[PDB]
Amino acid sequence: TPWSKSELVRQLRDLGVRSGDMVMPHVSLRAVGPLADGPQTLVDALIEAVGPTGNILAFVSWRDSPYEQTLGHDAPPAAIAQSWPAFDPDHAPAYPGFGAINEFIRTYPGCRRTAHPDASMAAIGPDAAWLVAPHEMGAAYGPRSPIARFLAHAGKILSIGAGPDAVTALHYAEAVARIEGKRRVTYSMPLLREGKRVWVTTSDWDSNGILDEYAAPDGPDAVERIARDYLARTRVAQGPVGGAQSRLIDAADIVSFGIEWLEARHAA
Ligand SMILES: CC(C)(COP(=O)(O)OP(=O)(O)OC[C@H]1O[C@@H](n2cnc3c(N)ncnc32)[C@H](O)[C@@H]1OP(=O)(O)O)[C@@H](O)C(=O)NCCC(=O)NCCS
Ligand SMILES: CN[C@@H]1[C@@H](O)[C@@H](O[C@@H]2[C@@H](O)[C@H](O[C@H]3OC(CN)=CC[C@H]3N)[C@@H](N)C[C@H]2N)OC[C@]1(C)O
């Protein structure tokens, strides 16, 4: 029997989600199980759980982000630069690898989208505009990003059947950690400014591993190691949402634990 919207709201309430909360979900729909009206059922339950004064923030990125196509170049290669589509935030599909739920979140009426094509965030609620802008190239997940403002607003990280590697907010801890040898990457993204495509090339922290030892793809990254150490030492509300076991994490607390985790293991 498919999970109903009211059943999920009760589960989210037991987990600790309150009206007015600012929640960042990381979801595995296969772990949730069949829903009454598909993935939209979970989206409706999330929005009812946070209430009218609450907010939902999701890292949705972009299905056609030219990350690897421009990685390590001073400029987009000629073939990429001429024909690649401009990132239209209100029309660009989410990256499917980060969760099929995000395309349902992105297309919810009233949802806002940040202008960073690769690190694009989706936000629903009264603070959606403040969350999504600004989001410049070179500030993907650190200060001045939607993650930073999410951390300054008592945000809660809701992992629904997702592994510890999914804690995207921990990339802020990597960005501000005062450690030596931090990895950086250079890529180019096509922005849509006033109907005109504008290519922007920037450098930023490597979101696939802040240090070399955490960047092997086979391959637990710094996000997974920090989250597992945190979840092993911290009392976190855990319970079912649908068929998936879930956690409601204090975003500012795990990011503070992440900065201390990195700076305790690597010199300045
Ligand atoms: C990676 C991860 C998504 C994999 O878990 P998953 O359940 O296997 O993947 P999804 O959540 O996208 O669920 C996919 C299911 O929904 C289906 N689906 C996709 N789009 C659909 C749509 N429009 N309508 C109905 N069903 C759809 C998929 O087909 C699939 O179902 P199927 O296998 O029976 O065909 C999950 O483990 C996770 O970690 N999520 C958080 C990731 C994140 O936030 N990353 C940010 C960078 S760290
Ligand atoms: C859309 N373009 C994408 C580009 O944004 C970037 O995506 C990053 C992504 O891997 C990271 O998630 C994975 O990390 C690892 C191993 N490191 C294991 C599984 C995942 N948790 C996330 N933490 C940060 C993302 N920015 O690289 C790939 C890309 C497809 O090009």
Tab-separated table of C-alpha atoms and ligand atoms in Angstrom:
chain	number	residue	atom	x	y	z
A	1	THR	CA	0.000	0.000	0.000
A	2	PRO	CA	1.498	3.328	-1.090
A	3	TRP	CA	2.393	5.856	1.583
A	4	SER	CA	-0.071	8.727	1.854
A	5	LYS	CA	0.739	12.406	2.287
A	6	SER	CA	-0.773	12.451	5.785
A	7	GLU	CA	1.270	9.399	6.808
A	8	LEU	CA	4.518	11.070	5.729
A	9	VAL	CA	3.669	14.310	7.553
A	10	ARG	CA	3.121	12.357	10.775
A	11	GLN	CA	6.465	10.608	10.259
A	12	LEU	CA	8.181	13.942	9.590
A	13	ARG	CA	6.557	15.330	12.746
A	14	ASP	CA	7.799	12.398	14.848
A	15	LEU	CA	11.287	12.931	13.421
A	16	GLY	CA	11.264	16.513	14.701
A	17	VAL	CA	10.250	18.607	11.693
A	18	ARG	CA	8.233	21.591	12.928
A	19	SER	CA	6.225	24.269	11.156
A	20	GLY	CA	8.608	27.100	10.314
A	21	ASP	CA	11.729	24.942	9.993
A	22	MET	CA	14.208	25.469	7.160
A	23	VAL	CA	14.912	21.971	5.845
A	24	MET	CA	17.439	20.666	3.317
A	25	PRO	CA	16.422	17.185	2.081
A	26	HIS	CA	18.630	14.414	0.718
A	27	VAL	CA	16.334	11.651	-0.502
A	28	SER	CA	16.529	8.115	-1.877
A	29	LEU	CA	13.140	7.482	-3.477
A	30	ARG	CA	13.838	3.752	-3.814
A	31	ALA	CA	14.332	3.633	-0.040
A	32	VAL	CA	11.099	5.570	0.559
A	33	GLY	CA	9.009	3.043	-1.358
A	34	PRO	CA	5.856	3.525	-3.421
A	35	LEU	CA	3.996	6.773	-2.781
A	36	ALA	CA	0.324	7.556	-3.332
A	37	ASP	CA	0.912	9.949	-6.251
A	38	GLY	CA	4.580	9.232	-6.907
A	39	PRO	CA	7.447	11.470	-5.783
A	40	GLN	CA	5.093	14.472	-5.641
A	41	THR	CA	3.502	12.945	-2.527
A	42	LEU	CA	6.768	13.333	-0.609
A	43	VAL	CA	7.190	16.894	-1.908
A	44	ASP	CA	3.714	17.856	-0.687
A	45	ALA	CA	4.386	16.269	2.709
A	46	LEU	CA	7.683	18.149	3.060
A	47	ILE	CA	6.006	21.484	2.325
A	48	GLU	CA	3.145	20.843	4.748
A	49	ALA	CA	5.646	19.796	7.426
A	50	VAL	CA	7.652	23.028	7.188
A	51	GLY	CA	4.472	25.120	7.052
A	52	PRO	CA	3.855	28.469	5.356
A	53	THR	CA	6.663	30.225	7.246
A	54	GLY	CA	9.071	27.315	6.727
A	55	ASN	CA	11.483	26.785	3.868
A	56	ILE	CA	12.872	23.961	1.741
A	57	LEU	CA	16.362	24.201	0.236
A	58	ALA	CA	17.716	21.580	-2.157
A	59	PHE	CA	20.974	21.144	-4.069
A	60	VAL	CA	19.592	20.298	-7.502
A	61	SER	CA	22.514	21.389	-9.775
A	62	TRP	CA	21.893	21.023	-13.545
A	63	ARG	CA	21.472	17.962	-15.756
A	64	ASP	CA	23.572	19.514	-18.554
A	65	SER	CA	26.268	21.239	-16.496
A	66	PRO	CA	29.489	21.455	-18.592
A	67	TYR	CA	31.672	20.609	-15.588
A	68	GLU	CA	33.913	17.889	-17.031
A	69	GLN	CA	33.739	19.485	-20.492
A	70	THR	CA	35.430	22.650	-19.167
A	71	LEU	CA	37.343	21.263	-16.165
A	72	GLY	CA	40.947	22.425	-15.984
A	73	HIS	CA	40.717	24.979	-18.803
A	74	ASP	CA	41.222	28.746	-18.836
A	75	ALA	CA	38.113	29.000	-21.046
A	76	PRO	CA	35.398	26.762	-22.516
A	77	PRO	CA	36.739	24.735	-25.453
A	78	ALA	CA	35.636	26.088	-28.819
A	79	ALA	CA	33.016	23.419	-29.545
A	80	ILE	CA	31.529	23.717	-26.051
A	81	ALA	CA	31.565	27.523	-25.992
A	82	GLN	CA	29.696	28.025	-29.266
A	83	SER	CA	26.674	25.755	-28.832
A	84	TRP	CA	26.241	24.879	-25.149
A	85	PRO	CA	22.843	25.973	-23.783
A	86	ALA	CA	22.760	28.886	-21.374
A	87	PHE	CA	21.685	28.012	-17.834
A	88	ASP	CA	18.066	29.171	-17.637
A	89	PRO	CA	17.383	28.732	-13.901
A	90	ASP	CA	13.590	28.591	-14.252
A	91	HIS	CA	13.806	26.021	-17.076
A	92	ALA	CA	16.917	23.861	-16.524
A	93	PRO	CA	16.345	20.284	-15.299
A	94	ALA	CA	18.059	19.128	-12.133
A	95	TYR	CA	20.991	16.728	-12.134
A	96	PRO	CA	19.386	13.258	-11.874
A	97	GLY	CA	22.354	11.788	-9.988
A	98	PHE	CA	21.585	13.867	-6.889
A	99	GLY	CA	18.060	12.477	-6.499
A	100	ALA	CA	14.989	12.216	-8.706
A	101	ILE	CA	13.068	14.167	-6.043
A	102	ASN	CA	14.896	17.361	-7.015
A	103	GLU	CA	13.178	17.715	-10.393
A	104	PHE	CA	9.857	17.587	-8.533
A	105	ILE	CA	11.136	20.160	-6.030
A	106	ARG	CA	12.514	22.414	-8.776
A	107	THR	CA	9.202	22.532	-10.662
A	108	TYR	CA	7.013	23.232	-7.628
A	109	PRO	CA	5.033	26.461	-8.175
A	110	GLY	CA	6.819	29.377	-6.543
A	111	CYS	CA	10.169	27.585	-6.300
A	112	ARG	CA	13.257	29.745	-6.826
A	113	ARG	CA	16.546	28.781	-8.475
A	114	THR	CA	20.074	30.090	-7.982
A	115	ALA	CA	22.058	31.315	-10.981
A	116	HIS	CA	25.066	29.050	-10.314
A	117	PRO	CA	24.674	26.395	-13.041
A	118	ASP	CA	26.767	23.641	-11.446
A	119	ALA	CA	25.952	24.302	-7.765
A	120	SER	CA	22.344	25.330	-8.430
A	121	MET	CA	20.041	25.360	-5.405
A	122	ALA	CA	16.243	25.276	-5.320
A	123	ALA	CA	14.291	27.013	-2.564
A	124	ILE	CA	10.602	27.078	-1.613
A	125	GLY	CA	9.200	29.428	1.009
A	126	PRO	CA	9.252	33.029	2.235
A	127	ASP	CA	13.069	33.037	2.422
A	128	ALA	CA	13.477	31.435	-1.018
A	129	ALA	CA	14.598	34.658	-2.713
A	130	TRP	CA	17.086	35.443	0.062
A	131	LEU	CA	18.406	31.868	-0.066
A	132	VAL	CA	18.926	31.688	-3.829
A	133	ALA	CA	20.574	35.067	-4.468
A	134	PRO	CA	23.355	35.818	-4.734
A	135	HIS	CA	25.108	32.686	-6.035
A	136	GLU	CA	28.158	33.803	-8.002
A	137	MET	CA	30.737	31.638	-9.714
A	138	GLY	CA	33.560	30.985	-7.278
A	139	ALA	CA	31.216	30.751	-4.268
A	140	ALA	CA	29.546	27.390	-4.857
A	141	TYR	CA	29.170	26.097	-1.289
A	142	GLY	CA	31.226	28.375	0.971
A	143	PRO	CA	30.631	31.936	2.148
A	144	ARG	CA	28.145	34.005	0.101
A	145	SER	CA	26.503	30.782	-1.154
A	146	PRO	CA	22.975	29.580	-0.358
A	147	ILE	CA	24.639	27.048	1.959
A	148	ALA	CA	26.151	29.849	4.055
A	149	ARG	CA	22.810	31.628	4.459
A	150	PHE	CA	21.191	28.254	5.163
A	151	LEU	CA	23.715	27.783	7.976
A	152	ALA	CA	22.970	31.259	9.363
A	153	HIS	CA	19.233	30.462	9.563
A	154	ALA	CA	19.192	27.413	11.889
A	155	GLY	CA	18.826	25.027	8.968
A	156	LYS	CA	18.060	21.337	9.418
A	157	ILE	CA	19.496	18.623	7.166
A	158	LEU	CA	16.912	15.911	6.447
A	159	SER	CA	18.489	12.723	5.090
A	160	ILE	CA	15.724	10.412	3.858
A	161	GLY	CA	17.412	7.099	3.109
A	162	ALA	CA	20.524	8.890	1.835
A	163	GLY	CA	24.047	7.940	2.828
A	164	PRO	CA	26.433	10.080	4.851
A	165	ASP	CA	28.143	11.221	1.632
A	166	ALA	CA	25.044	13.255	0.712
A	167	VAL	CA	25.549	15.985	3.347
A	168	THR	CA	26.194	18.754	0.815
A	169	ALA	CA	26.312	21.423	3.541
A	170	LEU	CA	29.634	19.984	4.758
A	171	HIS	CA	31.268	21.546	1.685
A	172	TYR	CA	31.037	24.835	3.581
A	173	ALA	CA	33.253	23.320	6.284
A	174	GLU	CA	35.753	22.380	3.574
A	175	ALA	CA	35.615	25.888	2.105
A	176	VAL	CA	36.451	27.704	5.355
A	177	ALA	CA	38.727	25.112	6.992
A	178	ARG	CA	42.170	26.593	7.684
A	179	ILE	CA	44.165	23.627	6.393
A	180	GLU	CA	47.068	23.243	3.992
A	181	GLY	CA	46.869	21.727	0.532
A	182	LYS	CA	43.199	22.367	-0.225
A	183	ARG	CA	42.236	21.264	-3.730
A	184	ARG	CA	40.818	23.774	-6.203
A	185	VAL	CA	39.186	23.314	-9.604
A	186	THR	CA	38.670	25.558	-12.629
A	187	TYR	CA	35.623	25.304	-14.887
A	188	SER	CA	33.375	27.443	-17.074
A	189	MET	CA	29.602	27.856	-16.899
A	190	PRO	CA	27.215	29.545	-19.356
A	191	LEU	CA	25.001	32.012	-17.496
A	192	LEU	CA	21.807	33.611	-18.810
A	193	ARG	CA	21.977	37.350	-18.067
A	194	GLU	CA	19.228	39.495	-19.627
A	195	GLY	CA	18.470	36.863	-22.261
A	196	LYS	CA	22.123	36.739	-23.379
A	197	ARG	CA	24.427	33.788	-22.736
A	198	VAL	CA	27.557	34.815	-20.816
A	199	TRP	CA	30.410	32.361	-20.272
A	200	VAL	CA	32.038	32.677	-16.841
A	201	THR	CA	35.263	30.904	-15.856
A	202	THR	CA	36.199	30.667	-12.183
A	203	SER	CA	38.219	28.707	-9.658
A	204	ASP	CA	36.640	27.229	-6.542
A	205	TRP	CA	37.140	24.514	-3.953
A	206	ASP	CA	36.974	20.951	-5.250
A	207	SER	CA	33.543	19.602	-4.303
A	208	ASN	CA	34.778	16.046	-5.002
A	209	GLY	CA	37.259	16.155	-2.111
A	210	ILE	CA	38.939	19.042	-0.316
A	211	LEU	CA	42.227	17.123	0.060
A	212	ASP	CA	44.003	14.617	-2.170
A	213	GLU	CA	43.433	11.759	0.288
A	214	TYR	CA	39.676	12.491	0.219
A	215	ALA	CA	39.401	12.870	-3.571
A	216	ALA	CA	39.948	9.308	-4.793
A	217	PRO	CA	36.700	8.227	-6.512
A	218	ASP	CA	36.649	4.730	-4.967
A	219	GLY	CA	36.729	6.574	-2.543
A	220	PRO	CA	34.995	7.894	0.587
A	221	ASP	CA	35.350	11.665	0.452
A	222	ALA	CA	35.755	14.130	3.312
A	223	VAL	CA	31.978	14.639	3.480
A	224	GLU	CA	31.362	10.946	4.149
A	225	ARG	CA	34.141	10.593	6.733
A	226	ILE	CA	33.057	13.727	8.618
A	227	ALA	CA	29.372	12.779	8.581
A	228	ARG	CA	30.085	9.247	9.816
A	229	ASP	CA	32.312	10.510	12.635
A	230	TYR	CA	29.619	13.052	13.526
A	231	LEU	CA	26.720	10.585	13.423
A	232	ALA	CA	28.752	8.166	15.562
A	233	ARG	CA	29.270	10.774	18.311
A	234	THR	CA	26.056	12.834	18.221
A	235	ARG	CA	22.480	12.232	19.345
A	236	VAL	CA	20.420	12.758	16.178
A	237	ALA	CA	16.698	12.118	15.776
A	238	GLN	CA	16.294	9.015	13.610
A	239	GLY	CA	13.080	7.456	12.362
A	240	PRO	CA	11.141	6.284	9.318
A	241	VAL	CA	9.907	8.482	6.485
A	242	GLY	CA	7.986	6.146	4.236
A	243	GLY	CA	10.117	3.022	4.077
A	244	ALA	CA	13.432	4.868	4.444
A	245	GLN	CA	15.228	5.438	7.727
A	246	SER	CA	15.887	9.143	8.148
A	247	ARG	CA	17.882	11.628	10.218
A	248	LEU	CA	17.198	15.266	11.097
A	249	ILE	CA	20.582	16.954	11.540
A	250	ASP	CA	21.396	20.403	12.887
A	251	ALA	CA	23.224	21.957	9.941
A	252	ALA	CA	25.264	24.477	11.936
A	253	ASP	CA	26.349	21.794	14.412
A	254	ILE	CA	27.645	19.304	11.838
A	255	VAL	CA	29.406	22.063	9.885
A	256	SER	CA	31.103	23.262	13.074
A	257	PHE	CA	32.072	19.646	13.754
A	258	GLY	CA	33.389	19.445	10.192
A	259	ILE	CA	35.645	22.490	10.508
A	260	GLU	CA	37.055	21.116	13.765
A	261	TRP	CA	37.396	17.665	12.176
A	262	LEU	CA	39.474	18.991	9.271
A	263	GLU	CA	41.630	21.436	11.243
A	264	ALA	CA	42.452	18.795	13.873
A	265	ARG	CA	43.887	16.419	11.247
A	266	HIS	CA	45.815	18.823	8.990
A	267	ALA	CA	48.170	21.708	9.711
A	268	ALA	CA	47.494	25.315	8.738
B	1	LIG	C1	22.014	8.896	-4.728
B	1	LIG	C2	20.612	8.500	-4.352
B	1	LIG	C3	19.681	9.451	-5.022
B	1	LIG	C4	20.330	7.075	-4.820
B	1	LIG	O1	19.135	6.604	-4.214
B	1	LIG	P1	17.932	6.127	-5.264
B	1	LIG	O2	16.625	5.913	-4.515
B	1	LIG	O3	18.352	4.792	-5.881
B	1	LIG	O4	17.759	7.327	-6.475
B	1	LIG	P2	16.424	8.327	-6.522
B	1	LIG	O5	16.188	8.997	-5.199
B	1	LIG	O6	16.618	9.401	-7.563
B	1	LIG	O7	15.073	7.431	-6.906
B	1	LIG	C5	14.956	6.990	-8.232
B	1	LIG	C6	13.615	6.304	-8.415
B	1	LIG	O8	12.687	7.204	-8.640
B	1	LIG	C7	12.276	7.013	-10.221
B	1	LIG	N1	11.963	8.225	-10.915
B	1	LIG	C8	12.800	9.112	-11.460
B	1	LIG	N2	12.092	10.101	-12.015
B	1	LIG	C9	10.791	9.811	-11.817
B	1	LIG	C10	9.622	10.492	-12.186
B	1	LIG	N3	9.443	11.715	-12.895
B	1	LIG	N4	8.431	10.010	-11.879
B	1	LIG	C11	8.349	8.836	-11.195
B	1	LIG	N5	9.480	8.157	-10.824
B	1	LIG	C12	10.712	8.655	-11.142
B	1	LIG	C13	13.350	6.505	-10.764
B	1	LIG	O9	13.033	5.954	-12.043
B	1	LIG	C14	13.675	5.431	-9.718
B	1	LIG	O10	12.706	4.514	-9.693
B	1	LIG	P3	12.972	3.033	-10.465
B	1	LIG	O11	14.373	2.562	-10.166
B	1	LIG	O12	11.988	2.021	-9.928
B	1	LIG	O13	12.780	3.196	-11.987
B	1	LIG	C15	20.447	8.552	-2.811
B	1	LIG	O14	21.111	7.495	-2.263
B	1	LIG	C16	21.050	9.872	-2.259
B	1	LIG	O15	22.157	9.878	-1.761
B	1	LIG	N6	20.244	11.148	-2.385
B	1	LIG	C17	20.853	12.449	-1.892
B	1	LIG	C18	21.884	12.824	-2.974
B	1	LIG	C19	22.309	14.305	-2.898
B	1	LIG	O16	21.632	15.117	-2.369
B	1	LIG	N7	23.524	14.683	-3.487
B	1	LIG	C20	23.951	16.062	-3.438
B	1	LIG	C21	25.490	16.018	-3.679
B	1	LIG	S1	26.228	15.195	-2.205
B	2	LIG	C1	26.647	18.424	-11.980
B	2	LIG	N1	28.102	18.399	-12.163
B	2	LIG	C2	28.744	17.559	-11.062
B	2	LIG	C3	29.649	18.441	-10.272
B	2	LIG	O1	28.884	19.476	-9.654
B	2	LIG	C4	30.333	17.618	-9.176
B	2	LIG	O2	29.338	17.091	-8.430
B	2	LIG	C5	29.787	16.954	-7.039
B	2	LIG	C6	29.477	15.541	-6.602
B	2	LIG	O3	30.362	14.668	-7.264
B	2	LIG	C7	29.521	15.263	-5.055
B	2	LIG	O4	28.715	14.164	-4.760
B	2	LIG	C8	29.366	12.870	-4.970
B	2	LIG	O5	30.821	12.893	-4.311
B	2	LIG	C9	31.405	11.611	-4.357
B	2	LIG	C10	32.858	11.470	-4.630
B	2	LIG	N2	33.605	12.746	-4.501
B	2	LIG	C11	30.501	10.333	-4.133
B	2	LIG	C12	29.198	10.427	-4.504
B	2	LIG	C13	28.573	11.964	-4.449
B	2	LIG	N3	28.244	12.293	-2.992
B	2	LIG	C14	28.948	16.406	-4.162
B	2	LIG	N4	29.369	16.203	-2.851
B	2	LIG	C15	29.511	17.770	-4.712
B	2	LIG	C16	29.089	17.950	-6.207
B	2	LIG	N5	29.363	19.328	-6.665
B	2	LIG	O6	31.148	16.522	-9.754
B	2	LIG	C17	30.328	15.638	-10.625
B	2	LIG	C18	29.496	16.420	-11.669
B	2	LIG	C19	28.503	15.413	-12.331
B	2	LIG	O7	30.377	16.929	-12.673
